Amino acid sequence: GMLWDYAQPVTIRFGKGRAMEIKDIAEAMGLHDGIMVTPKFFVDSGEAQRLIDASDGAVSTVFTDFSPNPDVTEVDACAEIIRKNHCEFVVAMGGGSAMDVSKAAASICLTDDSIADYHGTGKAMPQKHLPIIALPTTAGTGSEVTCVSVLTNRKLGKKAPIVSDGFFPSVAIVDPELTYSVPPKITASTGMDVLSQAIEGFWSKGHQPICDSCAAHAAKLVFKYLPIAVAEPHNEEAREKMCEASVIAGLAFTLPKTTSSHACSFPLTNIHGIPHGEACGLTLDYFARINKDAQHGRVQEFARGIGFKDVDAMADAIHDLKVRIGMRTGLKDLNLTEEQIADLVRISRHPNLYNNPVEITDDMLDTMYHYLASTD
Amino acid sequence: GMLWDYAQPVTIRFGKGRAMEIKDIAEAMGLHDGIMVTPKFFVDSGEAQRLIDASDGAVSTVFTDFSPNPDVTEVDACAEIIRKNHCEFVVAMGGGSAMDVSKAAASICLTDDSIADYHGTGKAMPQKHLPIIALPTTAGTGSEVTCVSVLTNRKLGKKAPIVSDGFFPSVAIVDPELTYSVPPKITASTGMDVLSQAIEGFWSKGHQPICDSCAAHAAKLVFKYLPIAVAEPHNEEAREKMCEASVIAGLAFTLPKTTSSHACSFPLTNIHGIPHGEACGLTLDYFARINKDAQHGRVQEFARGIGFKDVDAMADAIHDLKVRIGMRTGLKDLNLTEEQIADLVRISRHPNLYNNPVEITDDMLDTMYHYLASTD
Ligand SMILES: [Zn+2]
Ligand SMILES: [Zn+2]
């Protein structure tokens, strides 16, 4: 007998060109003077102004002063801009960073505190917030359907997530046109993020059947369309299918949580500069073979459902995909020392590691990292 | 270019025994003095009082005075009980009827109007409502995750649905134990409702990928577990799997809407007394063979995905399933006249018929109903 809780409060508006529907949402909610939180890139490309003009006054303010890893100071500056301009809703347009700034700011602007007071301090967030409209511009982190904001405190050397039900966007507009300009290398890494979220969401010990269905759907799309999107950045079908996979994989992993590849990805990114998606993909087929017979055949059933003979064939396809799109298959070029490998082993023991269906021991991590350290 | 809107506002608590969590939900919402809307069967069996006593005073009122086809007068009576008792939330425990009554009563109780003023009159419902906790006792109509209430006005001779965003339950508790007492003939019919909802939701012109994923998951479960649930009413695994299929098929059909089998089911139930799920099942394999090659092979991919060689093998299995569980394969025993057959043809032209991926003409309906009229 299974027990699970399923809650997915975000409304998804999917479709090419639908980023122009910000006005519709604001009008339906009776809100004015929105603030758009977006990286400077979309100001320079005229995308921001295009969407601002389309809002016919619904959005009045733009905030771009945040970093790819957002800081609590940038959230606090964003919240003060909200107060000064009396903003009633937040349009988060960008990758994970813009969305995580927006979730935090939309809550804290209603108070006179700093976001740091709730950053890892164990203190629960206030729950009243400005409505958030999230417009992902990559495919993707899936952040547009999560209630998590990952921030850093640079002055305090701390990086922790903040979880609050008030962080769920009200509407996610998933518009594939906003991804057409993502460069091939970033398309590849963000695509591997989707595939990792889907596969790990399915085989997590916290698996539940609705997320299972989303995971299989998204994974199948990535194998077919990710090579097309990397090789043909203006192939509209492949971009649309990657955006479909991205948002649905977001629905797949949010509740079951991720597992071994995500646990290992954090030191690969933070210490060695490997982008998140590529870092997840580095271990994805390795752990797939470890997990092949887990849960009385569930993963084999998954592999067959998305079109492979078995898990080993899916693992081969993961490797082949990585090679085709230029994602790391090894770490030999890092010339890792034994001390560095021991650091990877130690820091990879993250709570997510325990969601893997097979126990991943320290000796297994040591074996994996020595394997990667001697593989191109 | 795919366009779709996805919204699923219901929180689902799935699990054997979790109907005891009513008080935990009322606590979290800060609500008291709930009313339980449930058929007399559950009062007589002791199950209602078992759950009310478990709620530690959360539920103070019981309402059973409604019909298997609920009337506007019974909704109004429920709303008056709510007002008299200052009830703050509604617990709908039963099949489609109890959930239909509960949704409409929870909105209309905040007005001094009859629900009849909003029943097929073009007048939209007021949107404020008491929160609804839905506890389905069959697997199922899926009503615990829809915003639709189907009511009849016996004095006016009208049977029509009311659609309102305020009708969405706040929480759906899907506790398979509540289905253990469903007799085999009703288990069979409600199970065919699940299968039709899943298959029609998938091939509907309004199809969208999250609903597609849910549909395939639910349909696969029905083929395996519905014969077991019918043959073994206290097989806990089969009852749990049918509940999983039921709530997930509810997610599959709510947004894309149902199609030809549901359109035809309405006169089959309203004129000839055939229960809803059985009435949908009567035409499901028939329309499958008409629809098999629509949408450039989508339905064939669906059939293969859930394990059939093709749609015709799936339709064969739908037929074999109906025979095994005692569901109607024909209408010969009704000795239908040519006028009655024409009535079926005419009345089956419901708005949902145009959701079918292949145009269903009057000639095609005439052929189908003459076939059914000549088949055991
Ligand atoms: Zn990730
Ligand atoms: Zn139905």
Author numbering:
A (entry chain A), B (entry chain C): 0 to 375
Which passages does the manuscript contain on this structure?
Here we report the biochemical and structural characterization of this M-ADH enzyme, which we refer to as BkTauF. We demonstrate that it is a novel sulfoacetaldehyde reductase, which differs from BwSarD in active site residues and metabolic function. BkTauF catalyzed both sulfoacetaldehyde reduction and isethionate oxidation, as measured using a continuous spectrophotometric assay monitoring the decrease/increase in absorbance at 340 nm due to consumption/production of NAD(P)H. The optimal reaction pH for sulfoacetaldehyde reduction was 7.5, while that for isethionate oxidation was 10.0. Each monomer consists of an N-terminal domain (α1–α5 and β1–β9; residues 1–178) with Rossmann fold, and a C-terminal helical domain (α6-α14; residues 179–375), similar to other structurally characterized M-ADH enzymes.
Crystal structures of BkTauF, both in the apo form and in complex with the NAD+ cofactor, were solved at 1.9 and 3.0 Å resolution, respectively. The apo and NAD+-bound structures are nearly identical, with RMSD of 0.37 Å over 375 Cα atoms. The asymmetric unit contains four monomers. Out of the four monomers in the asymmetric unit, only one contains the catalytic Zn(II) ion, coordinated to Asp192, Gln196, His261 and His275. Catalytic activity of BkTauF was abolished by chelation with EDTA, and recovered up to 85% by addition of Zn2+ and 15% by addition of Fe2+, suggesting that the physiological metal cofactor for BkTauF is Zn2+. Furthermore, the putative isethionate-binding site adjacent to the catalytic Zn2+ is very open, which precluded molecular docking. The present crystal structure could represent an ‘open’ conformation, and further conformational changes could occur subsequent to isethionate binding to form an enclosed active site resembling that of other M-ADH enzymes like FucO.
